[PDB]
């Protein structure tokens, strides 16, 4: 339903190996991917042209054997499960890839902040600059920060517990399927963005 | 507990300033909660206006005389009565002619004493009249 | 700052506005009895290889070996009791916060 | 510490509260009265000296001011404060009408 001029820049692509990223997908997924990144995928071997036989069934990369010996039949339940697994992996990758940015006020050049942060603020900035919606109950601070939350200025890190790990079976490729480490950098900013 | 001891050692603001900062963050959160409200609200005629309200208890607030009227039921309960009051409602300062077919003997004050003339008003601290009717226009 | 007599405001309460070890009670009190030759009034806990000292009289200007600046203050951090290598209080607080008091 | 300066060079006298107490117990009360007075009156020698002479310090309990009949002034310190304690649990007394209805 895209416009023709916009669709001219995209091409239908079937994913062979699960790739994380704004232009990625799960193994056996059809998506409109941009020309440059789609050509990169097809040159690397992670993508295939969506023929009808391939839409029926596909071969995929096996992590254990390191070869494209995994034949897969594209079905509805398979698509649903793989989409959910891709969502879980994308959330993990987003929260484990880069820094989180906080900007607040602190009178003077002290080391502690004027107003300490909380799980609500952490989840707010997560949804803001990561586009990930989570509830504050999953955010568990460090042993020293269980009292007053994030208070130091500079660099800190918190734990975020992801419940859905063993149901989908991610414990192999992921470092730790139980929780993830969110690195948060807190700084002093101008008034309009500090707001406190 | 070296780390938390050192953190408790150094602080940029005293306890009272930190209390005021927490009050500031609470005011900001209240502003955000207030802004998160919807734009409009679909209400009915017969039901009182204070039935769809979303919301320090057991006491009388400053808005008691207003929430009494908000809790009491509405007066105009139907568009029939609403228009039956509107069609009788009339304006005076409206630019243009006005209907007079009701009674012929009556003359409006504008037609009777012109437009540049107004009745003398009792000017005192209690009641103030509008001044310079010439400047009153545009 | 000085806002009272030593009967009410101690000498180590002058730097109460600065963050760090000054906001605690010093361990050693040389202000009573005989006076020191260098006029040191207090000495805090020896953190690793650094120990803080508060002088008396006008601030003796010294050179902090960490920042390299001449610093005029009453607070001086001596490294391993060697009085040739001194630190201003700002570098001392930063060294401790980074956890470099044992290394530097 | 209680310190002061004399006219001689290096005359920075520094005595402990214990030393001032073993010298004269009234000296401590007089010093603290002088501090509490100079807190508000330090500009005028009159306003900072005249009040102090109205205090009648006495080490022991005996005192010759029995004719003036001094009233036993009562004063409450600003420290008294009741921190919140656990609500004590006790049995509730019911009512026949409450059990009926």
């Amino acid at each position: 339903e895209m416009a023709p001029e916009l669709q001219l820049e995209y091409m239908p692509v079937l994913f062979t190996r699960t790739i994380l990223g704004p232009q990625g997908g799960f193994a056996g997924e059809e998506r409109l991917v941009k020309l440059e990144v789609a050509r990169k995928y097809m040159e690397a071997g992670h993508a295939v042209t969506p023929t009808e036989e391939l839409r029926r069934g596909l071969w995929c990369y096996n992590p254990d054997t390191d070869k494209y010996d995994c034949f897969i039949e594209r079905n509805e339940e398979f698509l649903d499960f793989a989409a959910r697994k891709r969502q879980w992996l994308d959330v993990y990758w987003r929260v484990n890839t880069g820094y989180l940015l906080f900007g607040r006020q602190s009178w003077g050049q002290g080391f502690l902040i004027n107003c300490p942060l909380r799980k609500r603020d952490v989840a707010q900035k997560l949804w803001e600059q990561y586009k990930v919606r989570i509830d504050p109950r999953l955010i568990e601070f460090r042993e020293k920060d269980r009292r007053t939350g994030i208070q130091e200025l500079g660099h800190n890190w918190c734990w975020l517990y992801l419940p859905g790990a063993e149901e989908l079976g991610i414990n192999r490729e992921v470092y730790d399927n139980k929780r993830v480490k969110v690195r948060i950098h807190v700084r002093k900013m101008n008034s309009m963005f500090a707001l406190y | 507990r070296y780390r938390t001891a050192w953190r408790e050692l150094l602080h940029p603001l005293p306890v009272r300033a930190r209390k005021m900062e927490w009050l500031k963050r609470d005011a900001v959160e209240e502003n955000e909660e207030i802004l998160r409200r919807p734009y409009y609200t679909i209400k009915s005629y017969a039901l009182p206006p204070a039935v769809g309200r979303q919301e320090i208890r057991g006491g009388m607030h400053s808005s008691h005389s207003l929430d009494l009227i908000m809790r009491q039921p509405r007066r105009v309960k139907t568009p029939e009565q609403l228009r039956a009051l509107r069609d009788r409602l009339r304006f005076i300062g409206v630019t243009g002619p006005m209907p007079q077919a009701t009674s012929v003997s009556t003359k409006s004050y504008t037609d009777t004493y012109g437009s540049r003339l107004r009745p003398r008003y009792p000017e005192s601290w209690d009641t103030v009249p509008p001044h310079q009717p010439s400047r009153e226009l545009l | 700052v000085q806002t009272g007599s030593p009967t009410h405001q101690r000498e180590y309460e002058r730097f109460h506005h600065l963050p760090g070890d000054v906001r605690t009670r010093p361990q050693f009190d040389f202000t009573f009895g005989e006076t020191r030759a260098d006029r040191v009034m207090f000495a805090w806990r020896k953190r690793g290889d650094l120990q803080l000292y508060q002088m008396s009289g006008r601030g003796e200007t010294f050179v902090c070996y960490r920042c390299g600046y001449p610093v005029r203050s009453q607070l001086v951090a001596v490294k391993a009791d060697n009085w040739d290598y001194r630190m201003c209080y700002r570098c001392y607080t930063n060294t401790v916060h980074r956890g470099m008091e044992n290394d530097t | 510490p209680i310190t002061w300066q004399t006219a001689y060079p290096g005359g920075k006298y520094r005595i402990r509260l214990t030393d001032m107490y073993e010298r004269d117990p009234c000296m401590l009360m007089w010093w603290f009265l002088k501090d509490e007075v100079n807190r508000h009156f330090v500009r005028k020698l009159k306003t900072r000296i005249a009040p102090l002479e109205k205090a009648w310090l006495y080490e022991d309990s005996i005192h010759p001011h029995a004719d003036k009949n001094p009233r036993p002034l009562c004063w409450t310190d600003p420290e008294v404060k009741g921190w919140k304690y656990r609500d004590p649990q006790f049995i509730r007394r019911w009512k026949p009408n409450e059990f009926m209805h």
């Binding site: 003077g108 050049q109 | - | 700052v1 000085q2 806002t3 506005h17 600065l18 | 600003p78 420290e79 008294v80």
Partner: peptide
Amino acid sequence: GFGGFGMSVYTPKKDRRFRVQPLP
């Protein structure tokens, strides 16, 4: 408040006005 490192130290006049009593 309490100034940090970069802010210069300024000595203000002692508040000599009469203060009310701190009742409990």
